């Protein structure tokens, strides 16, 4: 279907407690496939999905080298941030990074991303055109100029349109059996009385992949927000996702409320009624 | 597949 690959890294300085904690993860759509943790024993990029274990030693050696190199880059970036923001060498700080590519249903390139955040605030982000940057502030402005003079945008662009797409397409094929299927939500509704004149209706969606889903309560066919709760989509731990939405109703009016469920694995949106 | 980030210095 339509698809993405993403990498995330988080560096956390811990002055006096040693070098920064570094943790990186790779995703294809909503499926994690690799990880690296600077505090782990192996000091290796490690598999997190079975289809990535098809790759041979040369892959693992290469990805390990490149991820370790990146941990060193971002460690240095923690250092440089201290000087730009004029901060004490004693603080603990956080640097976060994300990049990736989207491809169409037959593997055509659609989009690339590259972004940094410092202490949870945007720092620098490659623009949609993949040839320039949005600097969040004056610090990131210096980085932007530095990246322009060296041709960082070109080298990021070529990665996003080339290696990123090529890898994504390959992972999709090797992991077709699981990455290329949707799990439509299994749905049901529950009824609980809260008093003698009120009940709770809860709409459930379980066992779905991917995570994107919408759940909507209507009363007489009209969107209802009052007296509802809606939890954040949540992982089951087994690769699939869970969600629910609840509405308070007066006893004897249950038949007036409807729950709608939308998910790519559903040909037509579902409707549940008590 | 991870990129090279040698140039991504702030």
């Amino acid at each position, epitope marked *: 279907g339509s698809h993405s690959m993403r990498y995330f890294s988080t560096s956390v300085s811990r002055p006096g407690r040693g070098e920064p904690r570094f943790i990186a993860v790779g995703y294809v759509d909503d499926t994690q496939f690799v990880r690296f943790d600077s505090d782990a024993a192996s000091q290796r990029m490690e598999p997190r999905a079975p289809w990535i274990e098809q790759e041979g030693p*040369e*892959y693992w*050696d*290469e*990805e*390990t*080298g*490149k*991820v*370790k*190199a*990146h*941990s*060193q*880059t971002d460690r*240095e970036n923690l250092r440089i941030a201290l000087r730009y923001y004029n901060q004490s060498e004693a603080g603990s700080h956080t640097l976060q990074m994300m990049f990736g590519c989207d491809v169409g249903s037959d593997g055509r390139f659609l989009r690339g991303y590259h972004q940094y955040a410092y202490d949870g605030k945007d720092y620098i982000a490659l623009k949609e055109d993949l040839r320039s940057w949005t600097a969040a502030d004056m610090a990131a402005q210096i980085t932007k100029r530095k990246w322009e003079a*060296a*041709h960082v945008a*070109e*080298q990021q662009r*070529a*990665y996003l349109e*080339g*290696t990123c797409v090529d*890898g994504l397409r390959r992972y999709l094929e090797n992991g077709k059996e699981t990455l290329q299927r949707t799990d439509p939500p299994k749905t049901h509704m529950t009824h609980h009385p809260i008093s003698d004149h009120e009940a709770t209706l809860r709409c459930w969606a379980l066992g779905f992949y991917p995570a994107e889903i919408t759940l909507t309560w209507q009363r007489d066919g009209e969107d209802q927000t009052q007296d509802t709760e809606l939890v954040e989509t949540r992982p089951a731990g087994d690769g699939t996702f869970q969600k629910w939405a609840a509405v308070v109703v007066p006893s004897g009016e249950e038949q007036r409320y409807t729950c709608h469920v939308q998910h790519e694995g559903l040909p037509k949106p579902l409707t549940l009624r008590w | *597949r*991870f*990129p*090279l980030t*040698f*140039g991504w*210095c702030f």
Partner: T-cell receptor, first 114, second 116 residues
Framework: DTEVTQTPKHLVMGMTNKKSLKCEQH?????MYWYKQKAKKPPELMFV???????INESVPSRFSPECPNSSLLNLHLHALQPEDSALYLC????????????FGPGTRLTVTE | AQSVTQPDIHITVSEGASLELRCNYS??????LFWYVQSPGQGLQLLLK??????LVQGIKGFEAEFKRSQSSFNLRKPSVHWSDAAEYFC??????????????FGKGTKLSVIP
């Protein structure tokens, strides 16, 4: 000066001797390399140092003993070699950030004889 | 992992004619790319490097190079070769080692003979 310097430029050794190659670099670089080169072959990496720490050892026999006194200097101490160790010993330097590149020294021309 | 191939170990040109020296690499990303030249006595001199952006690079000694992504090639070119260009030539890739610190991997080299 974008120049890595090596001494001695030429060296002759028996199989008993101890000698030291010295390499120096003023570019502010934090990565330095030792290579060995035989005739008709490309440079073969022996050692990488990052931040005065040994990062890569390409199974270098113990008769070569590397040292990093500071970010500017790299030494190679030579002890009880064989004739087959005769080679061009190239020192090199590189940045650890920005645009990757390696600057080579002129090399030490080493002859070990029986 | 990262290997570099110079398919032609030995090339001969007549002085004043043009030169192409072939180089291919094999790596899961786009590395840094280089051509070095070495005379018999000396160490290695950098000719040109690719980081880069534009596929056509300009170097010293009248040398240029073309990066071809679909090929993974980085071929050394020179319009009109001088007799003194006769030397050893090495392309190289720069990329992370297993330890994450960067390193050069050389091709086996190309001997250039020029007929003066």
């Amino acid at each position: 000066d974008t120049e890595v310097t090596q001494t001695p430029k030429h060296l002759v050794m028996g199989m008993t001797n101890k000698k030291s190659l010295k390499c120096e670099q003023h570019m502010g670089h934090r990565a330095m390399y030792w290579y060995k080169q035989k005739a008709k072959k490309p440079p073969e990496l022996m050692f990488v140092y990052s931040y005065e720490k040994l990062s890569i050892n390409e199974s270098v026999p113990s008769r070569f003993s590397p040292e990093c006194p500071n970010s500017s200097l790299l030494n190679l101490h030579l002890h009880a070699l064989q004739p087959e160790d005769s080679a061009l010993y190239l020192c090199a330097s590189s940045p650890t950030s920005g645009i990757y590149e390696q600057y080579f020294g002129p090399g030490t021309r080493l002859t070990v004889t029986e | 992992a990262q290997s570099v191939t110079q398919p032609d170990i030995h090339i001969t040109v007549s002085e004043g004619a043009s030169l192409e020296l072939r180089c291919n690499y094999s790596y899961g990303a786009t590395p840094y790319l280089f051509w070095y030249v070495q005379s018999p006595g000396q160490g290695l001199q950098l000719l040109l490097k690719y980081f880069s952006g534009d596929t056509l690079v300009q170097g010293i000694k009248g040398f240029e190079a073309e990066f071809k992504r679909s090929q993974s090639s980085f071929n050394l070119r020179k319009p009109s070769v001088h007799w003194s260009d006769a030397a050893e030539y090495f392309c190289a890739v720069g990329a992370p080692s297993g330890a994450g610190s960067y390193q050069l991997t050389f091709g086996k080299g190309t001997k250039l003979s020029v007929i003066p």
